[PDB]
Amino acid sequence: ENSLLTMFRELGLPLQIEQFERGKTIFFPGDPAERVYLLVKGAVKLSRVYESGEEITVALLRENSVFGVLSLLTGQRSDRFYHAVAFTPVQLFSVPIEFMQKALIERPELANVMLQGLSSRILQTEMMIETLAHRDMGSRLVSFLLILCRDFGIPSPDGITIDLKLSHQAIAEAIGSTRVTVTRLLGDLRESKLIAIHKKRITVFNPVALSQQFS
Amino acid sequence: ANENSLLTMFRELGLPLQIEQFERGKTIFFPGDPAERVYLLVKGAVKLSRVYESGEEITVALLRENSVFGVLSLLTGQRSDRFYHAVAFTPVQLFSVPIEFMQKALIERPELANVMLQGLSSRILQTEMMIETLAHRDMGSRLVSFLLILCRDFGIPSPDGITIDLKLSHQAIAEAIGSTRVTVTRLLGDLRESKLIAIHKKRITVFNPVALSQQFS
Numbered sequence: 094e095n096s097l098l099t100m101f102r103e104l105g106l107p108l109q110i111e112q113f114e115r116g117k118t119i120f121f122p123g124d125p126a127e128r129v130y131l132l133v134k135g136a137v138k139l140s141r142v143y144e145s146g147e148e149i150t151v152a153l154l155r156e157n158s159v160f161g162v163l164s165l166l167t168g169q170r171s172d173r174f175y176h177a178v179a180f181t182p183v184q185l186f187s188v189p190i191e192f193m194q195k196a197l198i199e200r201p202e203l204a205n206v207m208l209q210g211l212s213s214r215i216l217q218t219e220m221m222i223e224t225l226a227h228r229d230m231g232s233r234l235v236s237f238l239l240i241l242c243r244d245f246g247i248p249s250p251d252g253i254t255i256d257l258k259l260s261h262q263a264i265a266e267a268i269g270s271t272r273v274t275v276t277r278l279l280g281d282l283r284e285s286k287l288i289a290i291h292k293k294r295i296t297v298f299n300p301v302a303l304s305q306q307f308s
Numbered sequence: 309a310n311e312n313s314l315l316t317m318f319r320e321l322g323l324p325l326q327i328e329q330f331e332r333g334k335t336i337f338f339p340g341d342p343a344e345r346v347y348l349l350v351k352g353a354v355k356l357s358r359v360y361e362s363g364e365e366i367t368v369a370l371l372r373e374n375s376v377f378g379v380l381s382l383l384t385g386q387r388s389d390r391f392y393h394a395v396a397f398t399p400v401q402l403f404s405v406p407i408e409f410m411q412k413a414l415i416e417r418p419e420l421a422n423v424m425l426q427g428l429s430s431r432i433l434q435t436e437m438m439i440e441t442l443a444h445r446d447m448g449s450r451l452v453s454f455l456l457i458l459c460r461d462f463g464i465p466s467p468d469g470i471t472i473d474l475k476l477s478h479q480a481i482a483e484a485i486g487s488t489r490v491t492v493t494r495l496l497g498d499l500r501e502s503k504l505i506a507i508h509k510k511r512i513t514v515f516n517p518v519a520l521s522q523q524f525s
């Protein structure tokens with residue numbers, strides 16, 4: 094998160110927020126990749142959709158993330174191949190690519206803000222490769238929950254509460270598992286008093302302690 | 309592509325900038341080193357991994373030619389420390405630049421941010437393709453999907469399909485697909501018996517890679 098906000102704000106009279114209700118699509122596979130986006134409030138899910146209807150989550154984007162990054166690849170005018178959806182209610186800015194290109198020229202300083210933003214995305218995607226590299230599905234779940242604690246967490250007496258409504262199917266789609274398995278594993282974590290769930294919001298106790306097993 | 313442009317830009321980031329050689333298996337940066345440089349991989353493959361206290365390494369990226377990496381330096385500079393291990397997976401040729409020399413070249417050569425932004429966008433997309441590979445629930449499909457990425461990244465034409473132009477130990481494969489070595493040995497054995505790949509001195513050839521990728525639609 095940073096003053097990506099300030100600079101996106103001034104790319105327009107001012108650039109206007111676009112709102113998306115929970116579950117609405119920001120872009121569809123097959124759409125032209127002609128815009129870059131700054132997520133301002135909420136979380137955006139990027140997924141791969143297969144012919145069977147099955148959907149796999151490739152990114153759960155946090156506030157102040159740059160995305161739609163395919164659009165920066167020129168000279169290809171190609172099409173979106175992921176589906177971007179508002180995972181919660183969402184506020185974002187969106188900019189046609191030509192505008193971006195030009196703003197970078199007439200203010201060199203803002204190159205540096207974008208490079209930092211894309212660097213941060215690379216690192217966050219690599220953290221999700223680590224989560225998925227685990228063979229114990231439990232460790233995989235715990236690792237994913239710690240990333241969410243960091244990305245979407247708010248303080249609690251007990252620990253950190255993930256400020257997101259999480260369905261078990263949504264967790265399954267993000268950690269390469271199934272609803273049934275996720276339910277069993279969340280159940281085990283609850284019995285052991287490592288987490289608690291209230292209204293589909295997972296609170297994890299002692300996330301710093303719990304993250305030790307991940308050397 | 310942006311590849312040509314990254315090369316030129318980096319090459320002309322002089323006192324003209326000199327290629328550095330790394331022998332196979334040599335470390336480019338260790339966890340705990342200060343994050344003071346950005347890198348451009350020119351020839352070869354660089355393995356990025358996480359190292360746990362047991363000494364076990366997990367692969368987080370097998371970087372292909374013309375990749376920008378060391379990207380943590382673009383946030384924090386020397387201020388923060390590396391937390392991944394970068395290793396020359398083959399013999400490697402690369403350019404590297406102190407972070408300050410980068411930032412300065414960007415202000416002086418405005419349009420050059422573009423080329424860097426393309427490079428980093430490309431890294432995001434490749435890492436996401438690796439999340440897809442790893443999302444697969446059965447190890448077999450994980451393996452095949454990985455091998456197809458490698459065909460694209462490091463493949464050369466063979467008269468049967470594509471040869472992945474890298475030596476791939478069973479251990480190395482296991483560290484990349486979240487499996488055990490034993491599982492990889494058996495799966496590579498199954499792919500050979502089904503006449504889907506051939507292996508010679510650790511170089512894997514996959515027959516008809518386009519047809520095989522259709523199963524992943």
Ligand SMILES: O=C(O)CCC(=O)C(=O)O
Pocket residue numbers: 126139152159160161162163164172173174175432
């Ligand atoms: O990670 C991202 O920024 C979204 C991927 C993308 O740009 C696209 O699908 O067009």
Ligand SMILES: O=C(O)CCC(=O)C(=O)O
Pocket residue numbers: 215216219343356369376377378379380381389390391392
């Ligand atoms: O993904 C990369 O470019 C390498 C990650 C990095 O910059 C670092 O670990 O310092």
